[PDB]
Design a protein around this motif. Structure first.
Motif, PDB file in Angstrom:
ATOM      1  N   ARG A  76      -6.363   5.413  -7.685  1.00 44.40           N
ATOM      2  CA  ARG A  76      -4.756   4.844  -6.824  1.00 44.40           C
ATOM      3  C   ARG A  76      -4.922   5.017  -6.056  1.00 44.40           C
ATOM      4  NH1 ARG A  76      -4.345   8.998 -10.822  1.00 44.40           N
ATOM      5  NH2 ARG A  76      -2.844  10.831 -10.225  1.00 44.40           N
ATOM      6  N   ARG A  77      -3.579   5.064  -5.696  1.00 46.96           N
ATOM      7  CA  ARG A  77      -4.014   4.905  -3.345  1.00 46.96           C
ATOM      8  C   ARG A  77      -2.674   4.986  -3.477  1.00 46.96           C
ATOM      9  NH1 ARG A  77      -9.045   1.095  -2.501  1.00 46.96           N
ATOM     10  NH2 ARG A  77      -9.553   2.520  -4.181  1.00 46.96           N
ATOM     11  N   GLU A  78      -1.859   5.388  -2.527  1.00 43.97           N
ATOM     12  CA  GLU A  78      -0.699   5.457  -1.304  1.00 43.97           C
ATOM     13  C   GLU A  78      -1.524   4.444  -0.176  1.00 43.97           C
ATOM     14  OE1 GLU A  78       1.949   8.939  -1.274  1.00 43.97           O
ATOM     15  OE2 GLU A  78       3.247   6.964  -0.404  1.00 43.97           O
ATOM     16  N   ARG A  79      -2.806   4.820   0.035  1.00 44.54           N
ATOM     17  CA  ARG A  79      -3.007   4.402   1.815  1.00 44.54           C
ATOM     18  C   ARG A  79      -3.206   2.951   2.180  1.00 44.54           C
ATOM     19  NH1 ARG A  79      -8.069   4.708   4.688  1.00 44.54           N
ATOM     20  NH2 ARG A  79      -9.079   4.911   2.188  1.00 44.54           N
ATOM     21  N   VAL A  80      -3.049   2.161   1.154  1.00 43.58           N
ATOM     22  CA  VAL A  80      -3.057   0.952   1.073  1.00 43.58           C
ATOM     23  C   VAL A  80      -1.623  -0.048   1.417  1.00 43.58           C
ATOM     24  CG1 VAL A  80      -4.997   0.509  -0.047  1.00 43.58           C
ATOM     25  CG2 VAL A  80      -2.554   0.185  -1.314  1.00 43.58           C
ATOM     26  N   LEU A 107      -7.219   0.232  11.687  1.00 45.66           N
ATOM     27  CA  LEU A 107      -7.205  -0.373  10.696  1.00 45.66           C
ATOM     28  C   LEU A 107      -8.356  -0.437  10.205  1.00 45.66           C
ATOM     29  CD1 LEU A 107      -3.674  -2.053  11.828  1.00 45.66           C
ATOM     30  CD2 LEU A 107      -4.426   0.206  10.599  1.00 45.66           C
ATOM     31  N   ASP A 108      -8.815  -0.042   9.536  1.00 53.96           N
ATOM     32  CA  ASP A 108      -9.789  -0.621   8.649  1.00 53.96           C
ATOM     33  C   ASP A 108      -9.227  -1.626   7.447  1.00 53.96           C
ATOM     34  OD1 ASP A 108     -12.380  -0.809   7.056  1.00 53.96           O
ATOM     35  OD2 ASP A 108     -12.230   1.329   6.350  1.00 53.96           O
ATOM     36  N   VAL A 109      -9.762  -2.391   7.163  1.00 58.88           N
ATOM     37  CA  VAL A 109      -9.816  -3.949   6.661  1.00 58.88           C
ATOM     38  C   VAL A 109     -10.213  -3.799   5.713  1.00 58.88           C
ATOM     39  CG1 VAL A 109     -11.757  -5.543   7.174  1.00 58.88           C
ATOM     40  CG2 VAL A 109      -9.819  -6.334   6.772  1.00 58.88           C
ATOM     41  N   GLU A 110     -10.026  -4.227   4.286  1.00 58.32           N
ATOM     42  CA  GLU A 110     -10.298  -3.848   2.844  1.00 58.32           C
ATOM     43  C   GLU A 110     -11.039  -5.302   1.731  1.00 58.32           C
ATOM     44  OE1 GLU A 110      -7.192  -2.334   1.021  1.00 58.32           O
ATOM     45  OE2 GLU A 110      -7.485   0.237   2.105  1.00 58.32           O
ATOM     46  N   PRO A 111     -11.972  -5.442   1.339  1.00 57.99           N
ATOM     47  CA  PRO A 111     -12.287  -7.137   0.979  1.00 57.99           C
ATOM     48  C   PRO A 111     -11.570  -6.238  -0.320  1.00 57.99           C
ATOM     49  CG  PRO A 111     -13.744  -5.637   1.405  1.00 57.99           C
ATOM     50  CD  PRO A 111     -13.225  -5.308   2.330  1.00 57.99           C
ATOM     51  N   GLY A 112     -12.432  -8.070  -1.295  1.00 56.75           N
ATOM     52  CA  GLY A 112     -12.214  -6.745  -2.680  1.00 56.75           C
ATOM     53  C   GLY A 112     -10.732  -7.005  -3.145  1.00 56.75           C
ATOM     54  N   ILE A 113     -10.025  -6.318  -2.931  1.00 56.55           N
ATOM     55  CA  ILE A 113      -8.180  -7.045  -2.725  1.00 56.55           C
ATOM     56  C   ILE A 113      -8.117  -7.660  -2.624  1.00 56.55           C
ATOM     57  CG2 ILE A 113      -6.159  -5.400  -2.591  1.00 56.55           C
ATOM     58  CD1 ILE A 113      -7.745  -3.196  -3.237  1.00 56.55           C
ATOM     59  N   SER A 114      -8.414  -8.001  -0.706  1.00 51.36           N
ATOM     60  CA  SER A 114      -7.608  -9.540  -0.490  1.00 51.36           C
ATOM     61  C   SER A 114      -8.085 -10.919  -1.389  1.00 51.36           C
ATOM     62  CB  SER A 114      -8.337  -9.388   0.558  1.00 51.36           C
ATOM     63  OG  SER A 114      -8.440  -8.727   1.631  1.00 51.36           O
TER      64      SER A 114
END
Lengths: 39, 48, 48, 148, 96, 148, 148
Positions: free
Chosen positions: C40-44, E2-9
């Motif tokens: 779990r994370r708040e940083r997103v 700002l580091d992009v995140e694949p997977g969740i996207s």
């Protein structure tokens, strides 16, 4: 939380059998039967 | 031998009494609903 | 640039409840268990 | 042994019952099988929950809350304590012959129930047919106003 | 940074890709016209003539982007005038 | 069998009501259908929770806490206990004709309600129009001074 | 129906209030509109939780804990009891209209303003409903003769 109380109170379209019987038998459980004695 | 019934339960299952329906605006009504109003329009005592 | 107001945080709590055999059962749920995320994370943050 | 939550309500109950009357002490000594001294029966109660439930069954006025609390906290003692504490009721002489007159009629009730639905559906239908007619008029009037 | 995140996207995109085919804008106005063709059944000399409805998501989107209510300018288009109780930049973002 | 949690609240209340008055004992014996003795009706209460709810409904002063706790802990008895517990709420002779005269009024109330919002919005709007004009002047003064 | 958890705390509180004073009969007749007998209003409380909240809000001696318990248990009655629990605070003679008392009334005025539009629009609609009936007939007769 998302309430479902308005969606909860519905009704299913009831439709009659051709033959009656087996109505109040929904929730009944008698004891298990034993086997005969062995010798 | 009754023309009113075959108009009333087509008004119900098409949605329009007087005006034509287009070929794209075609919806869906389940047969349980048309049975439940046929029970009211044309009454009998035998479900069959 | 000011990234802050053109996005919001990523957090969601909800609950399901059902009465079976006249017994009320309730399951709470969080936002990260639905994506299959172990941590779990708040940083997103999600852009609006 | 015995749970302390049970003991804190059971021990002053039995001790107060003995202080109220001493004739129950020989009675519980004969019923349980201990020595007639109060120290011996109280040590038996503190040692064994079956003996504790037997004493709390032999005294009944001031021990019902402690008995039901023992029945809450000790689920394993229930069947054994009910088997040990058992008295058969006396039967009337005319009961089975009086019961045999009703076989012709419970069958009538069940044949009504198989038609109506549940037994609850039969009870509610009999209440609705016994009900007054102004309620039928009120149903028709609320539907006449456009309320359903 | 700002580091992009694949997977969740990709999860969110794979959920949205059936939703975009069932919330198309050209399939709302057909429901509007079907409803208003069904419930009229009259001649429109009366009922104060015709009526017009108009919906602009490019204005609703700008009010969402600026954290403004889209349903406050629409209430002001009827009577024209704005309210002086709010501040200067709120009045400017309302009048534009 | 009745739960011990219900029994702790149910049995001493029934025993206290019987010790307060014995005139209820024949009443509950005729209502439930047991022998007239307190031991027999107490055996019926301990045996059957439907009978327990019937007794706790027949004694009405002290048995409300025990009745609601039985209704908490045995949720399945509620429908059958409501079927057995039914009394005819007596209707007035002028009620249906007095009701039929209010269709003129309720339709107007519901139409104003649909125009405003909910019935809560209608009540709050009626209170806002019932409220004094000094409040409108005061809020204009606060809006002129800057208080939104 | 009414929740048993809050009913166990709500029924004996108003029962002790009625047993303490009989002066609440005019209050429960005017606020609720139920029948004058003490059993009918108690059945109304047991049937309707809004009526239960009104009977917990009409007094503040001992029913405050039960009112807060019902507020914590059933959140759907909160806005409705907030709407029916409104007394127009008459006047404070000074200039400082502090929000310890006037916050509800100014919030209610601003909610009506968010519904209507301008504050001057609310004052204008207040006045137009305050006006006589004959101005409607005058506007209608001018619009009938052919003027607008």
């Amino acid at each position: 939380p998302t309430s479902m109380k308005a969606l909860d109170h519905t009704s299913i379209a009831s439709v009659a059998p051709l033959e009656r019987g087996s109505v109040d038998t929904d929730d009944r459980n008698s004891a298990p039967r034993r086997g005969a004695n062995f010798s | 031998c009754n023309p009113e019934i075959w108009r009333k339960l087509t008004a119900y299952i098409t949605g329009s009494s007087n005006r034509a329906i287009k070929a794209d605006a075609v919806g869906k009504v389940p047969p349980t609903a048309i049975l439940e109003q046929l029970r009211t329009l044309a009454p009998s005592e035998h479900e069959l | 640039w000011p990234w802050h107001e053109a996005s919001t945080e990523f957090a969601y709590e909800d609950a399901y409840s059902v009465t079976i055999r006249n017994k009320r059962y309730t399951a709470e749920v969080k936002e990260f268990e639905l994506l299959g995320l172990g941590q779990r994370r708040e940083r997103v943050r999600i852009l609006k | 042994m015995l749970l302390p939550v049970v003991a804190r309500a059971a021990v002053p109950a039995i001790e107060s019952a003995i202080a109220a009357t001493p004739g129950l002490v020989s009675r519980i000594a004969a019923a349980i099988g201990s020595k007639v001294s109060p120290s011996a029966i109280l040590a038996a109660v503190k040692s064994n929950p079956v003996v504790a439930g037997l004493t709390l069954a032999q005294i009944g006025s001031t021990g019902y809350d402690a008995y039901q609390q023992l029945l809450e906290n000790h689920p394993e003692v229930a069947e054994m304590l009910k088997d040990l504490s058992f008295k058969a009721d006396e039967i009337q002489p005319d009961f089975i012959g009086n019961l045999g007159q009703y076989r012709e009629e419970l069958e009538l009730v069940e044949d009504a129930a198989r038609f109506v639905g549940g037994m609850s559906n039969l009870i509610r239908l009999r209440q609705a047919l016994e009900l007054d007619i102004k309620y039928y008029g009120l149903k028709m009037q609320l539907n006449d106003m456009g309320y359903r | 940074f700002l580091d992009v995140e694949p997977g969740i996207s990709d999860r969110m995109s794979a959920t949205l890709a059936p939703i975009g085919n069932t919330f198309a804008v050209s399939a709302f106005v057909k429901n509007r016209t079907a409803v208003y063709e069904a419930v009229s059944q009259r001649g429109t000399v009366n009922s104060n003539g015709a009526e017009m409805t108009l919906g602009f998501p490019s204005v609703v989107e700008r009010d969402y982007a600026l954290d403004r209510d889209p349903m406050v300018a629409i209430a002001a288009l009827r009577t024209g005038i704005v309210d002086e109780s709010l501040e200067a930049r709120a009045s400017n973002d309302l009048k534009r």
